[PDB]
Each structure stands twice: as structure tokens, then as C-alpha cells.
Amino acid sequence: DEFYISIETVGNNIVERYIDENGKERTREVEYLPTMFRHCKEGKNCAPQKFPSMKDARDWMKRGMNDFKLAYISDTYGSEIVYDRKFVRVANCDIEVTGDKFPDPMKAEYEIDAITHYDSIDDRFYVFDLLNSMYGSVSKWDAKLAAKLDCEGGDEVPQEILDRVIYMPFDNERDMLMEYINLWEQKRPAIFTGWNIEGFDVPYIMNRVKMILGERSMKRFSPIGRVKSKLSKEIYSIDGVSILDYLDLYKKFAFTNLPSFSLESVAQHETKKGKLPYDGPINKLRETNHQRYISYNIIDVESVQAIDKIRGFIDLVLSMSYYAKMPFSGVMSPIKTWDAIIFNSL
Amino acid sequence: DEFYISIETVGNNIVERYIDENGKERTREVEYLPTMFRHCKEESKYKDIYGKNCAPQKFPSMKDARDWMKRMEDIGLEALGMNDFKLAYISDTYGSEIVYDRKFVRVANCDIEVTGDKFPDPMKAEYEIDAITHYDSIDDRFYVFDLLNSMYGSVSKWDAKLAAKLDCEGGDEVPQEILDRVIYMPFDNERDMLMEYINLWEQKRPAIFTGWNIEGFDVPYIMNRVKMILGERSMKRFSPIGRVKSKLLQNMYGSKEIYSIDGVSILDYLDLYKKFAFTNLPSFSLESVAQHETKKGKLPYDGPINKLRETNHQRYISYNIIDVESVQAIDKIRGFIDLVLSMSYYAKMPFSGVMSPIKTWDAIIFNSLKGE
Ligand SMILES: [Mn+2]
Ligand SMILES: [Zn+2]
Incomplete structure (x- = not known):
């Protein structure tokens, strides 16, 4: 019931392929404004800060992009993601x-x-x-x-x-x-x-x-x-x-x-x-x-x-991905997985 | 509202310290048998050196869990499956979003x-x-x-x-x-x-x-x-x-x-x-x-x-x-x-794992396959 399949960033827009309630694939591009961010993304990582208002966030836009995708996911998908492979x-x-x-x-x-x-x-x-x-x-x-x-x-x-x-x-x-x-x-x-x-x-x-x-x-x-x-x-x-x-x-x-x-x-x-x-x-x-x-x-x-x-x-790939709220390619990277968890832990 | 502070195993039991529903810390020894396991842990002692790991899988019956749990001692104290044993407990026990309060930590x-x-x-x-x-x-x-x-x-x-x-x-x-x-x-x-x-x-x-x-x-x-x-x-x-x-x-x-x-x-x-x-x-x-x-x-x-x-x-x-x-x-x-607590409860793993990308990735593999 509603889950991502692809998350791309063209311009300052988020093109996302997804599967809505009625098990059908669709697409919804959105001009998204990230909630959190990591100063260090201007082993080693850093704590995600949190923009109190879309104002100070917008004041931050443009000045890597994977946190954007991770931010999009965490924002548009809060709570346990439930999926069924039959539509994948x-x-x-x-x-x-x-x-x-x-x-x-x-x-x-x-x-x-x-x-x-x-x-x-x-x-x-x-x-x-x-x-x-x-x-x-x-x-x-x-x-x-x-x-x-x-x-x-x-x-x-x-x-x-x-x-x-x-x-x-x-x-x-x-x-x-x-x-x-x-x-x-x-x-x-x-x-x-x-x-x-x-x-x-x-x-x-x-x-x-x-x-x-x-x-x-x-x-x-x-x-x-x-x-x-x-x-x-x-x-x-x-x-x-x-x-x-x-x-x-x-x-x-x-x-x-x-x-x-x-x-x-x-x-x-x-x-x-x-x-x-x-x-x-x-x-x-x-x-x-x-x-x-x-x-x-x-x-x-x-x-x-x-x-x-x-x-x-x-199955593992989808499972790890949706549980860590990250894009499919991240499952083979301990670093990219850790990095996904740090951001989403907030 | 109900979250863990420490998860240790004494014997084949799990001993956990946790914060109950009245913000009161407490300890409990639980006789526990995992529902899942990784075949590579009772072997893989030098493999993430290779970078390898493996997918978890459900025990068909309790007889199997007992068999594995008994091979563990035959393996020893500091056996790798032991960490999965703690992971299984956390996932089975706290099968939902963990609501933690730093105030009680x-x-x-x-x-x-x-x-x-x-x-x-x-x-x-x-x-x-x-x-x-x-x-x-x-x-x-x-x-x-x-x-x-x-x-x-x-x-x-x-x-x-x-x-x-x-x-x-x-x-x-x-x-x-x-x-x-x-x-x-x-x-x-x-x-x-x-x-x-x-x-x-x-x-x-x-x-x-x-x-x-x-x-x-x-x-x-x-x-x-x-x-x-x-x-x-x-x-x-x-x-x-x-x-x-x-x-x-x-x-x-x-x-x-x-x-x-x-x-x-x-x-x-x-x-x-x-x-x-x-x-x-x-x-x-x-x-x-x-x-x-x-x-x-x-x-x-x-x-x-x-x-x-x-x-x-x-x-x-x-x-x-x-x-x-x-x-x-x-x-x-x-x-x-605070980051340590949020990562630990999200990934549903012990505080110490948060430090390594390897140990974090590892708990994700185990827990993603509906460890609960
Ligand atoms: Mn060929
Ligand atoms: Zn051929």
C-alpha cells in the first residue's frame, strides 16, 4: 500500500516511481524541501541537524544530493513501510x-x-x-x-x-x-x-x-x-x-x-x-x-x-531498503547503509 | 514507553535492563529461543574481512532452535551467533517503533x-x-x-x-x-x-x-x-x-x-x-x-x-x-x-553497534527479514 521503487532528483524536483494502494505503478514528481541536513555534506559522518522552519531550510537549499533523496523518503514515508513484491x-x-x-x-x-x-x-x-x-x-x-x-x-x-x-x-x-x-x-x-x-x-x-x-x-x-x-x-x-x-x-x-x-x-x-x-x-x-x-x-x-x-x-534487497528507508543500491554498502540509518534515526 | 537499556546473555538466557512504563528501570532474565538465525555466523569468523555476510532464515521448529542454541556452546562463549541471539530478542520483544525517553536513561x-x-x-x-x-x-x-x-x-x-x-x-x-x-x-x-x-x-x-x-x-x-x-x-x-x-x-x-x-x-x-x-x-x-x-x-x-x-x-x-x-x-x-540512542532504537540493536558501519549494516540484514 504505497511504497517507492525509484527516487530521482532532476532540477530541485523529486521524480518518484511508486506503487499506490491499488497495487499499480505510478509516478509523482515533486518540488521537495528537505527537513534535515548534514553540515558535513556541504568511519566519519556527522549528526543530522533539523530545520525548524521551511524558511531557514530554503535559505539553505542549493548550498551530497543523496541526503535529498534520503530526506524525501523519510519525509514522504514515515513509519513501517509495507510492500508486496508481486507489484515490483x-x-x-x-x-x-x-x-x-x-x-x-x-x-x-x-x-x-x-x-x-x-x-x-x-x-x-x-x-x-x-x-x-x-x-x-x-x-x-x-x-x-x-x-x-x-x-x-x-x-x-x-x-x-x-x-x-x-x-x-x-x-x-x-x-x-x-x-x-x-x-x-x-x-x-x-x-x-x-x-x-x-x-x-x-x-x-x-x-x-x-x-x-x-x-x-x-x-x-x-x-x-x-x-x-x-x-x-x-x-x-x-x-x-x-x-x-x-x-x-x-x-x-x-x-x-x-x-x-x-x-x-x-x-x-x-x-x-x-x-x-x-x-x-x-x-x-x-x-x-x-x-x-x-x-x-x-x-x-x-x-x-x-x-x-x-x-x-x-527479497533481502527490498527488505533492507525499506527498513533502512533507502534507495536499492545502498544494500551492498555498509557505509551507505550506516549513513542511511544516521539520517533516518531522527 | 517500555524500552531496553542493556541486553546480555547469561547462559542461554537473556538478561535485560529496561525502562518500564513508570519510567522505572528494571532487570529481567528471560529464557529465550531465537526464531531466526544466519548459517554464516557459526563459521564466518574471517569473512567481513572478505566482506561477506548472509541472509537470515526462520527456524522451522523449536527443535531446530534448540539444536542451534546447543551448537553455540560447542562453539564457545564469544560465538558470533550470540550477537544474532540478542538481535532476535530485541526484534521479537520490541516489534514496533521504540518510544524512548532520554530522561530515564x-x-x-x-x-x-x-x-x-x-x-x-x-x-x-x-x-x-x-x-x-x-x-x-x-x-x-x-x-x-x-x-x-x-x-x-x-x-x-x-x-x-x-x-x-x-x-x-x-x-x-x-x-x-x-x-x-x-x-x-x-x-x-x-x-x-x-x-x-x-x-x-x-x-x-x-x-x-x-x-x-x-x-x-x-x-x-x-x-x-x-x-x-x-x-x-x-x-x-x-x-x-x-x-x-x-x-x-x-x-x-x-x-x-x-x-x-x-x-x-x-x-x-x-x-x-x-x-x-x-x-x-x-x-x-x-x-x-x-x-x-x-x-x-x-x-x-x-x-x-x-x-x-x-x-x-x-x-x-x-x-x-x-x-x-x-x-x-x-x-x-x-x-x-542522543544520536547513539536514536540509531540503536531505529536499527533495533545494542548501543555499541552504532559505532561501526559494518556492525550496523549487519544488524540491518538480520532485522530487515521481519526478525520479529
Ligand atoms: Mn551472458
Ligand atoms: Zn548464455
């Missing part, structure tokens, strides 16, 4: 790219062959397939073929996953990227997860759409209008959407001493189910066996959700 | 004086402590324990009237507002003095005990001498639970023995000031900080300070109560004892 749009994605090994995401030279994107709300795996990626043109994926045992020419993708798939073929990357951007537009994720999304997936999709669809298409992702990056691996920031890499969440809260943290290693360890063995080379897979390629893409995207159903690290 | 701070040939090494504790001023926020009174006889010199009683007089009249210029709240108590000997100090603690138990360097000097010296003069059994009386233990840490902090008085949170004001004031000073001595914050200072002294009791014991005692009142003055400006 959690989406993860795993993209596929064929080309010279480790297609550097900063350069983004090669096309994207596939993009499965699960969306927790409608519980569907949207599969984007470019059966025309420069390296070749290949056949449509067989939702009926990918099931029948390997005693045949199929990959044993469980029926459950397949029932939830929505396949979408494209003969050119450009037309494919155009649709993906359209899906985020149609269904803006609250939290965007994956396994190494921060390292590969995200930067790649960005630098790509940039290099192709140009800067303006890339900003379609951020609801408020802009995507930044720290740039040698560079990382992207889609304002309005919390990007929480599951690999990081796993290393931080799983407490498992595994010799490897590849998705296959963790998935096999957690879910026990594996993925059908290879068959010859590796990268050539798309041409030397498309269809299995795509089935793999979806399988990988499901395993993240599978690990989560066991671990519940997305 | 006894904060005390002291400052001792030890005249000696060489620096009074706390671990050594060989020189007689010849003065102790102990302020108590509930009484709002300074308790001055003045030793008149030592191996250093017999001396005359302190003069409340000369103390207020100007330096030219041979006075100490200590404010009357302070002098009005003093409760002077001269002693013919140390044994008598310390025995009376212990009795003060037992009679007026601090919730929070502050000072300035009380952790590294005062507390250790006080404890080490009581032990050496009145024996271990007597020093244990400082704890409402009889548990008082030393800890020899080190390096840039030095091979410093520090003490723990279970039942009382010892929070050094020097630390709070270092973590929360946010001021760069070339010295964090009481004087530099006090001057800088309150704008007032102590009167200069033309003469060897290390001989001040022999040369001017009147000024010696006045300086002592000025120092003790300086901490309360600083706190009056800064408000750090």
Missing part, C-alpha cells in the same frame, strides 16, 4: 553475441544474435533472435524441438520454461534493438538483474545502440531521459531503474566457498540441474547448431530466477 | 587523577588514584571523591567557596552552576575511597558510561587498581551481572588492555567525536576539543603541573571537575549521546 517488476536478461572471442563491450563491433529477457510481472521469457547476424543467416528456433531428449536432435529445455516463452525473430539487428528498447518502454523494470550484466550485457547493449541507433535511442532506457557511464571496463547508469548484478549479490550474501562463480557453476550447485554438454567447438555454436544456441540463452536466463527462488536475495 | 562520565613518579600506566596501576569526579545525569550531580592522604602527600580538604573566587583572590573561577551540583566527599584513604566508588556504581548503575579516553586510561586504571587493592571479586561488582573482563588489543592503538563491564555500554566520547563531529584538529585532547567547542578554557598554571596536588591541591580538584563537566558541555552542543 523484476527483470533480468542474457544477451548473445558471436564474433572474435570476448567481444569487448566498450567497442561493441559485433551484432547481437539473441536477447532473452525475463519479466517477473507477466512471468514471460521474451526471446529476441537475429537469424541473420553477419556471420550468417540461420533458421527459426523450434520451441517444439527444444524439449525432446538428446537421443534426438533436441536440447532438454523443461516444458515450464518453454510454455512461458515468447519468441521474436528479426532479420537485422537494427530492427531487433528497436524492439528491445520498445519492450523496456512498454515494461520499465524496477530492478534489472542478470549474471555479469554490469560487466558485459548492459555496457554492450548501450555502446551498441549508441554506435548504431545513436545517442537518443540509448536514453530511451532511462525513464527520466539519460544514461551515464564511468569511463578500461566502463559501467553504465540508467537513471530511474536499479541495476543489481546477481553475481555481486551472490558473492556478497551466499556464503558459499565454490571454486568458480561462472553461472553454470552456481546454477549446478544450487539448482542441481545442469545444461546439456557441448559438441565440438564453442563460439561456432550459432552456425554449427543455432536453435540449441537460443535454448541455451533462455536456460541461462531462467537459472538466475531459479537461484533467486532458492536464495531470495531480491 | 542514566548517562554517567568520570575522570580520575593519579599522581605518580612516572606516567601512571593503566596496566601497571601502581600509583594511588587521588581523585575521581563522576557526573550522573539522573541526579545531575558531580560526585567528587578526594583522597587526602597518599604516598605523595597529606593534603587539605577542597574548598567549594575558594573554587568559585577569581584567580586574583586565590580562586579557581569554576562556575557556581557547576559548584552548586557538587557533592564533595574527602577520604582519609584509597581503600575506603574505592569501596565507596564501587558502592556508587551499584547504587546508581549507568546505562551509558562516557568520558574522554576513558576506554584506554580511566576504566582500565580504575579496574586494575580495584583488582590489585580490593581483589578480583570486588572489581566484578561494577557489572550488574558480575562479568568484567580485560582484552589486550594493539598496534597503532597499542598493546592496550581494555575492559568490558557487561550490563553497561562504555562509549568513549573521544571516539564519538572522532566519528561524528567532523572537525580537523591538530590535537584531540580534552582541552583542544573543549576550547574549540565551548569557547571557554581552564586557567593557566605557573608551576609544574605534575606536582599540582602537592603545590595546589585546591586547583587540582577544580580542574578535575571542570574536565568532567567539559564532556557534558560538548555533548550539549553536539548531541552525540
